[PDB]
């Protein structure tokens, strides 16, 4: 699968998002099962007060003040969480499933798998007709892959745009979610004009799930902040190391085959992406990139 | 399997349809557990007001004003969404199963898959079993090129389905935008029940009126994106005569300057595949020249 | 299962329609007994309310007395009728698999075609083993004496579609006739005064504006169903299903002596070539004395 | 595969029984969900009557009049439906699963199945292993004829079973038709609870009275059809000698003119097997002539 | 393959046991669903009586008179029927899983299954088949030596049947004794005067007319079960099952050197011959020394 | 699951545990379905008595007296039943899944299953490579087990824990069975907020819990009796030393040695299921049989 093409920052978030999502789901459930606002008329030994209100006047007051007193944030806290998590997940898996930049990844993975474990690699890095035929076919495949992928830049622009979009969505969320968080309170006042229906004008209301939504909001800000720090680090990683230019220096130094060229653009990007998992697949691919090795295979074929 | 024949617009529209179904199901789920209407009579220190009504008269009033005061759009918003999503699903994946129509596509897919990995293409672009495989490839290519060139059964149907989807777009957006303002919270109910209840005018509240409005806005936006994608698909479909294909670049980049020009359904399929990866075309075009057949026969000896 | 190739497109279409009809019927029945089925109030023929002075059980007495005295019989038993009609359709669609007289012949035919479809001699004849081919030929010979003796496997297939068409016509008739009798507000005039004190009541049927909509849907479905059946009723009449003629195979193979079969074998070939038009081609070679002449020559 | 020995009636009655069972189960299911009875006292502008009764005295009245005024049929109809259906199913099944009467059936089925695929059967109608298998099957059939052609234990039980089922039909139809008129909607209840409630006469409504009646009618219909088929069986076992079979058609057609006429259990079972496909009879008949055995012996020597 | 060692009576008994179980679960479920007792105070135009009792004093009275007036049989009838059914089931199967009486059964059944597919039996009534027959003969001798002195596979059968019969007698006894105490309306005289104000109440038990019918049905079913078990108990004792004579097989096969088995093996043969009286002949063929001498002669 | 390595003791105790769990679940289900307390005030022609209490003062009274008047046994009986049956099951099952005492069990079962059907047993009591392999695996397993302990002490240690737990359960169930009453009195000091100080309460599941407690006591008693008999059976001879004596006279072989420790322990256990596996194993325990097999192989 696409496990080799995923640094830590691209799997770490792959869990954070999930966590975020479940919070949202929990909220939604608890917003439906649990009760809601409860409102009582205000009058601005001990004996109780008689309001002389029915069982439907109370429901009318409750469901009028629910939407005439509560701030829009308190009413819909978790739906925004679900929307944001869904958009984040859509961002994380954009260039994997987009045609025009998906076949290249599949071909690269297939060729890397083929060349990772080859007898010719063992023979070449140490210092039959079938093996020689397979080796020659794989060299031709590598050459055609190089000429077919070493011209475009689609697998880098998409990734840059993706990270930029995730970072900006971070900034917006931490902006507004932090702005509107003191408006989730417990006891509110409701001043609606229902005087000819119930006989009372001012009410005091208690929102049930206020404290819990406040706690969940703080947890969500924390998780988002971690997400944003990870994304910022990735964005720094992209824009510092000149990711569109590879350099086979260490392979040349500790291999002895001093003719490996420096590939650029998309292939260099993919090499930089695959050496963050296990820095040896670059060696195996570099084996199949020297005219010297091709000449030695031709000579041994005879 | 079939992912190769599904361009980006198709998957984009499928995701939009999935989201549409999700919001429809969300609305349907909420309507059962929360939605209701509460109606009170109108009479046009602080003390309460006595109406002197039972628990049966209140239910009478509620369920009468529900169906005599609410606009039909507010009552059944999400069922329309579900029906439209169902129609959109039916329109998609419809040009696969109207006739059998599976042999014509699976045969082409298998042909292309076996042609892509044929070493003969690589050798031209640079044992007995290889010769037998090449002979079978040529024979089945000939059979399929003879079968396909019969008419238009997998091209016009695509046009019909896209046109139907666009028409459904226009209608849905039109009447969802027209009536989106009939979802209100507080309404006035004027029913003539005075000889059994005593009150004539009532004021009612619909529980879910600030949420159906937002779900409607989200649904309308998703609809608009869907329609824009469909319009682009139609523009691309009708801008280029996809029933005729020319191997202009293949002959120049390969040197075999005798490859013919195929048309109708086969050309349509070739253009369909050209979007995913413009490499299968050359691999198939390798097995389309009689000179290649002559070379294969000569080398098999 | 095994009896899958013996289903033209309209058969699976009608199966899907029938299952959808059953879903609608069960949905309606479930929604029926899920809520309060009626709300009835007495009638008395600044603003202040009216005190009926009725207990909590007198209201239930009134509700369920007027429910079965003011509602039209259609508004109550709609889902039950939907279920009954769907079950009848499903039973009718399969009254040619379970009858032993037709089941035996169908199993024999399917076994013969299964044996013939994977016989190398068919490929040999079409391109232009041994004892098994001869034995299969005698099996085919016996087969086209066992079945070709009358009209049993075909008479019931044309007898059932007529019944289905009649049922669809009757359903349309009495379901469009009585769709406007499902009202929302009704008047109930029962004589319960020594128990309650009120004689005239006004009632609301809660799910009256729902059964209406479902009804429409139901009609539409049967309408489509009807059309399909009509096509099949037309498909069995323009061409004589009891006469078959091997013509294209003769020209595409050259074995120009295959005869024209009649009766149930002809009908079965007609009904099975619409699934995959090659079973007739594969079977055709097992019908000519030339094929057996070549078999005997090859054996010697 | 105990389906070859099942004429059309023995498979029609099974579906009838399933339908009867589902009707009974549906009725028994709604027997509990819906509230049973509603009783109010009788006093033998417009204002209501103040009964001045609690919610406990109402329950007392309802649950006393329920069992002091309703007829036993109106209360126990579904249970009787289920009991009768279970008895019918048990009677239909008391033919395969009785020791001393099940081994013969399986032996016959296995022998007939093996004989249906012997190539000597088709050979006689125009290899060492095949020859010895044919000889062994000849001996097995000869032994079997000496096994189940002495006692009619497998034929008397079928007649007993069908007679009992007909009797049950008669009883069920009789009493259901007699009592179906006692399921009423509105009833009167005259119980002596005056020192506890203050009222002596009550009027009650039985909610599930217009429904059971309908189901009851349906039940009869199904049962009626059931009985008819059983009656047909008690004309098919008695219009000829069911214990004397005649292999006349096989001799007059195939040519083998020495096949014997079996009798008793074997004749009855052949008459039954000849109600599915008249080809098993001749496949078994061909393995009953000494001429065929002599021909096989000559071919073996 | 235990069905062969399962006479007809031990199928009918299993069916009766499952019927008893379904009746019991039926009763328990409908006991859960209902509302149980309803109690009202007694005062030992028409106007209703005001008892001036709260909504919790009714619950107090109802549940006090429940376990102060109802008989112990009317409350725990379903539990008793379930317990009896479980004991019956665990009693009928206590000779398959008890160690020391299970290995013998599996050995015997496996051997009898092996000694059915043998052409030597057909010959009575080639090197590999001869060796297989000799091995089977050696096995016959060895286990016939094995299960010949430990005669515990038939005492357990008699003991379980006796236990079942005794349990039948007890159940019938106290079910007939206490079936007239399931009454509908009862009088409850509890001393609660300073908490409710009333001293005497009259109560109705909801499930007083369904339990009577279920009790009668249970009595009928258990009576049939007991009659079957009584017949089986008579069967085991009118003749010694510990001795078997192979008279008919000897007279029919002319191998008249067959000895008479005894004790446990005689019991197993007596049990098996009542399913299909043919395995005895196969074992008779495969237990004689004449047959093995003939086999040895043929082998050479 | 190792049926042969289970005697009547194990099967009977497993069935008893199943029944125990059944009644425990039944009681817990009824408690969670229909079980509560109903309390009324006390005043220490017939007419009704007015308490003048709301619909929430009753809830308050019921909740307060459900915690100050009901004994902790009356409320938590099914939970204790479930916990104790669970621990019994775990203790009885904690003998095969120990990391280090499992392979010796299934390997022994496989060896004996192979030895049961070996033709050499038939030949002796009346394929050479297979017989040699079986002899080899047998002798290596003997060497491995004769020095490997922690397969006999664990059995005793688990069957002693069951006995002690039985004793404790009897102890605290017999004493607190008379505290499950139906009618109880509740004297809580809530007068300024309810108006009454003394209440009489009914617990709705007193009699049923009494019956279930009696059934539980009987079932434990039987379980403990069986466990005591098992302990007696283990502790009256050297279960770790088996004597191959009758084999010599009833087989003819005179060179059958007596195995030591855990292997003798399993031999003693498996002898009761069927006293014939010892025969098949003793056939292969002779050092002359291997010599005869080697001679016959040539």
Author numbering:
A (entry chain F): 16 to 59, 95 to 177, 231 to 405
B (entry chain E), D (entry chain C): 16 to 59, 95 to 176, 231 to 405
C (entry chain D): 15 to 59, 95 to 177, 234 to 405
E (entry chain B): 16 to 59, 95 to 175, 231 to 405
F (entry chain A): 16 to 59, 95 to 176, 234 to 405
Q: What do the paper's sentences say?
A:
8C-8A(IL125) consists of a 25-amino acid sequence unique to the first intracellular loop, IL1, of LRRC8A inserted into the corresponding region of LRRC8C. Like native VRAC/LRRC8 channels, 8C-8A(IL125) chimeras are activated strongly by cell swelling and low intracellular ionic strength. We demonstrate that the 8C-8A(IL125) chimeric channel is a large-pore seven-subunit heptamer, like homologous pannexin channels.
We obtained five distinct 3D classes for the 8C-8A(IL125) chimera. The most apparent difference between the structures is in the arrangement of the LRRDs. In class 1, all seven LRRDs are arranged circularly with roughly sevenfold symmetry. When the ICD and TMD are viewed from the cytoplasm, 8C-8A(IL125) subunits are organized into two distinct groups, one with four subunits and the other with three subunits. In two of the subunits in the class 1 structure, K51 points toward the pore, while D50 points in the opposite direction. In the five other subunits, D50 points toward the pore, and K51 is oriented toward the subunit interface. These grooves, located between the subunits forming the loose interface in the class 1 structure, connect the space within the ECD to the membrane-facing surface of the TMD.
